[PDB]
Design a protein around this ligand. Sequence first.
Ligand SMILES: CC[C@H](O)[C@@H](C)[C@H]1O[C@@H]1C[C@@](C)(O)/C=C/C=C(\C)[C@H]1OC(=O)C[C@H](O)CC[C@@](C)(O)[C@@H](OC(=O)N2CCN(C3CCCCCC3)CC2)/C=C/[C@@H]1C
Ligand SMILES: [Zn+2]
Ligand SMILES: [Zn+2]
Ligand SMILES: [Zn+2]
Lengths: 1180, 85, 76, 68
Amino acid sequence: MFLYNLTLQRATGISFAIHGNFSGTKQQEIVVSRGKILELLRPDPNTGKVHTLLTVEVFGVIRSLMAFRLTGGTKDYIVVGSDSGRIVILEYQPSKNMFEKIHQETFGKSGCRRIVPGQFLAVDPKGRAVMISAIEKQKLVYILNRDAAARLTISSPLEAHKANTLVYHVVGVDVGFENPMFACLEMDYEEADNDPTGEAAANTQQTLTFYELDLGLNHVVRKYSEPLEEHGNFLITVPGGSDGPSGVLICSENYITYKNFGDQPDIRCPIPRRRNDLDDPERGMIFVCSATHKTKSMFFFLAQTEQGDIFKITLETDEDMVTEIRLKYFDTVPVAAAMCVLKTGFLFVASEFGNHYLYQIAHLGDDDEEPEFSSAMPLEDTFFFQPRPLKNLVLVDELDSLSPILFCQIADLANEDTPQLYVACGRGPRSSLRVLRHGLEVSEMAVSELPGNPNAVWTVRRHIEDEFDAYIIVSFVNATLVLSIGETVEEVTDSGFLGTTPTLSCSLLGDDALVQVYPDGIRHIRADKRVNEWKTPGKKTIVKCAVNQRQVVIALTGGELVYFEMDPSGQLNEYTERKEMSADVVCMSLANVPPGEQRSRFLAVGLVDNTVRIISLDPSDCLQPLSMQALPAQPESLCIVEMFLYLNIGLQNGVLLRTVLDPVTGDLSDTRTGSRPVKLFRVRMQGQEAVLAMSSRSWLSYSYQSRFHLTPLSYETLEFASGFASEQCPEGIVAISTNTLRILALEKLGAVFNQVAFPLQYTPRKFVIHPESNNLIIIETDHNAYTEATKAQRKQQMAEEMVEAAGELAAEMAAAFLNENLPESIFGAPKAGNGQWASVIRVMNPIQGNTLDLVQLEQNEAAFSVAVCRFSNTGEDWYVLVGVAKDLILNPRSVAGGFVYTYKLVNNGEKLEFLHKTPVEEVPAAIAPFQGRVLIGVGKLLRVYDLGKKKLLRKCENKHIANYISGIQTIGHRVIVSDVQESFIWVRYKRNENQLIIFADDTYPRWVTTASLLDYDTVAGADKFGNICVVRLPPNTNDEVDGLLNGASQKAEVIMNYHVGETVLSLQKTTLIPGGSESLVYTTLSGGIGILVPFTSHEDHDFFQHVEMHLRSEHPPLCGRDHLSFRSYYFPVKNVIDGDLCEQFNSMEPNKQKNVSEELDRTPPEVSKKLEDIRTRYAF
Amino acid sequence: DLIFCRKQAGVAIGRLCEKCDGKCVICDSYVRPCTLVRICDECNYGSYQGRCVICGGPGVSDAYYCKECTIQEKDRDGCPKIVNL
Amino acid sequence: TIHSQLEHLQSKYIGTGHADTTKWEWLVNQHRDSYCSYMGHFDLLNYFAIAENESKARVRFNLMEKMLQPCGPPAD
Amino acid sequence: NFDEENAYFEDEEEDPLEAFMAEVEDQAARDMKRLEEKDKERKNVKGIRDDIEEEDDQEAYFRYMAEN
Ligand SMILES: CC[C@H](O)[C@@H](C)[C@H]1O[C@@H]1C[C@@](C)(O)/C=C/C=C(\C)[C@H]1OC(=O)C[C@H](O)CC[C@@](C)(O)[C@@H](OC(=O)N2CCN(C3CCCCCC3)CC2)/C=C/[C@@H]1C
Ligand SMILES: [Zn+2]
Ligand SMILES: [Zn+2]
Ligand SMILES: [Zn+2]
């Protein structure tokens, strides 16, 4: 078994984010880090849209990301520290649209290690030094310089090691062109390892250490070190030099401190709390991120707490000394991992989970009545504020993000033919269930169905500098109707066409000269009311034409090729030659003559002959055959298009061809994507050319900077369409359906999947599908959470206690505190308690989003497993079983017990009714229907359970599973068990002896997250550490059993090992496209979707193996990682080809593409076609 | 007294003499040179500027690690200059 | 003496052992580099922060605080 | 100091400052007198050089060989 890995949807979770002038111009861009992907974004200051410019797979783990600029430069660089032992410096090249590696410096071994630097990265604010640091003793400093050609030079590292030391955070300090300084939060643990009493562990303080780099003497020295009051998280650089003092802000638990070396005293400010908070009073408050905004007049900071409250921090200063810290409540947004404040007044919020946000900073300065807290204010007791809806910010853009994906099911729950992806994702009150579909989403523009026989509609404007169109002309079978956009579009008279017979061509001939072609001839119409008419000689009747604003070719009966032209005079002149051939045309196309040239030469001619003929039409060699190529079937239409020149060949079936424009075909690509004739029509996507192919389903074909995409749309069949433009929407489509006249639009910037979302209450854990009604039964559960009833009674308690505060009892804030509940999706849920849980069972319709039933559980009960099944001793009734833990503590782990609930699932799968509740002595983590009964994993125990009248009846039990059952899967005869730390146990159920016997196990420890059965002998598994494996039983395996490694007697073999780089939580074998092949689809915690597909021949496997081998050397990972070593992170790779490395061939430069291709004995286009073939065989 | 230096390596490139030209510094193999050798600053200074890392004669070409030593990440230790005490 | 230098460099690296290493030192070494590996890998921290319903900054700070004395104070 | 240009150029040969110098001389004399007196010095350590104050890996290896 040999597998090929493909990514269908990249990760969308953000870890780090930096901003700067990375292209060298005055506009600002953001560089975000996914787990293993680097990405450049640019928000538009005119519309507020965030566009993705570049995204690169780095094949490593990005751990720190900084931006810096040399003095006198206008371009920002990118410093990356990763899980390799290298520091890398990158530069964005706007003209090539790629990241160019400038420097690489190796300092240690690879991997996320304790003492090898790469976790912390600081840079001097003037850009002359950079510090890379590990969590332990090792720190390195590089000096950055510049030569006379203005290129960046790097020096050899300087060591600043210090044994038995832990680092919390490092930042560079802003000095005024003095010696560079770095600040560190450090802790010494030497004394704590020598005291058995445990008192040296306590009484141990953090220090704030300052490291000075002396460029004159070329060494790093410890200058200052001071113990702190309590332990603090990250540090903040205060802008110094000539704009501001030069110190640090230490963010801590419940406090924020300013500190500077010299004669400056320490200044502390406590963090304000929300008035009438519902969270556990024992919990403290920390800041989670920060954002600095420097202006040539002043500066301030933006810090956010764990509740999502952003405060605006300013600093009250003297000539050199700081006197006060002032805090003011700014706004409430979701908890972010990073915040970027952009010039032109934009705030970018990258959330830890879920969608990301871009805000417009609407209110500058602060003219408000809300109180401003200060460090000078005396308090014995803490500050209090009231959270409110957004006042300083306005929401401008929202970027979708599937992180974190927790459960997935691929299924056809609607009655389409293509399956949809049902994804339970999100955490807390921002969780949701999302339905993903492959295709584009058609936006509704206009609808007015008119009776008749519509055939075609153009959208031609009166002028060429016009952005407003002139008319739209829909032809009946008996007549036509031509309208204009007066914003109240209806019948129009002064158009000039007024066709009694249908209109088969409407073109903008001149600037305001229009060509009207119809079955009886052509009447050229002026700007003024004048018409010059050429009609048919006798009974020859045109059906097809080929228009262009400089030349018009027509087709009468018999292939009589008649070409016109309109020269700078502005009127008709027909050519002398009329070449006729054997048959009548069925297809032709004239390329849009560019403003650079005078006319179009190529004209593909498809006839009843079933051959494309290419013909010239310039006055030198006009209308004489050049090259002919037969067809596989009856063509309908073709079109020369761009986005470099191609043409497309539409058959009379639901299948397509393509040929690059040249005197000879150079490329070939056919996609089985119908049974209905393909109609090729002109449209404009992204403001440039594209072809809207139409079949039973309508597809859009568009390359995208060498990204070929044939994407369907979310609507049914049409028959004619073209671009549209109006004051209503200047860029759209005019599409025609049966008994319909539609205008449609497509506004999604290159997305493989369209999604709809339905909100939930808590973090979803697992859902099942009812087989009859196709309803979803979901369980949601959260830790540190209140139930609804507990929240209500806690709030009533707080009210009755605040009304008896022993004070005139004359003004009631309690009645105002009880009325309106602030929404938890915006302000967060009150996280209160350490062993407190909250769980819910929900029945949901997947077509709509409505909740059919909702069962709330008691306070400290936590649901972990759910199943829907039928019992043999009962009839055809359905039941729902929910496994629940009781008083679970996670660290140290402790649980009071467990329960199994049983419901009857009545009213056509819409209602749950409680039946009974069976106690168990441990957490039931897995429930699986099995042969008219049910298997339950109760902690370490595997049990069989039958349905009873008052509880569930234990029938069989095995007690030899190692640690903890996390999953159970059954194929008809056997049972597969997943252990939390061991990988897989095979069990057989003896039907007549009533015995569960272990007959096989594995030889590796695996932290299994999920498992999928591939056949009777093979299992696909996933891991907490980001690995996928396939395990198969040897053919020797004996099933009929009644240890050799302290285990089972027979072992299983590992036939596949792959490191993905992200934690997989869903695995499923399925077929994605209609008429395709089966693949293994997986899902990741960062929001990524990927497939593993098998090879069917040795030749494809060998070719792709050689491609991977040659691309491993000549196109190495960007951040210094070894590709083979990265995919062998925990186990060596076995029988997997990385198709994400292989598809990077299409993005190399032509010279290296030729060097790679000439070793495989092939050209780059052939390699590209071979790469596209395997992808389109399985996925989209 | 054949001991490696094992100090933090810098930007200086290691050199080999006419007798050691094809050799790997760590395992003394001659097959598939893969990674350019870096040396520390005290090994590259003054009279020590250009010298064989194996023996110490006048350098003529670049020193390399072999593919076998690169696979095992033996190029990630300190300066590989042979120093005698 | 190259072998002796290797025996001195292996001892230098933090986390290595020898014939007199006790259970406590071994276990605190693996706990400490487990916490560092959790801080490094982006999707393990995601898993923990979803499991215990906390912000990722809070989980990071908790791990750093646990770094000091994992497995309790030593014997005698 | 060598450049055929430097030799060419270096071949053709044939109140406020005073006040600044006086102030500098007074300050220097005071500092020299204070250091000579060594009467009031708290020896406030400016910056500790870790490399200078800590044995190197090679020194540690030599110490280990001497010990055994
Ligand atoms: C155990 C054998 C001994 O150690 C022995 C090599 C050595 O003790 C003797 C002393 C001495 C000086 O006479 C050694 C001679 C040296 C050789 C025979 C090597 O030849 C050279 O140095 C020539 C030159 O340096 C580079 C030639 C080169 C690249 O072919 C080198 O070998 C390689 O790198 N390979 C091995 C791998 N091989 C494959 C073939 C496909 C594409 C190229 C890379 C992979 C290509 C050639 C030399 C081989 C001899 C062992
Ligand atoms: Zn070697
Ligand atoms: Zn030599
Ligand atoms: Zn050295």
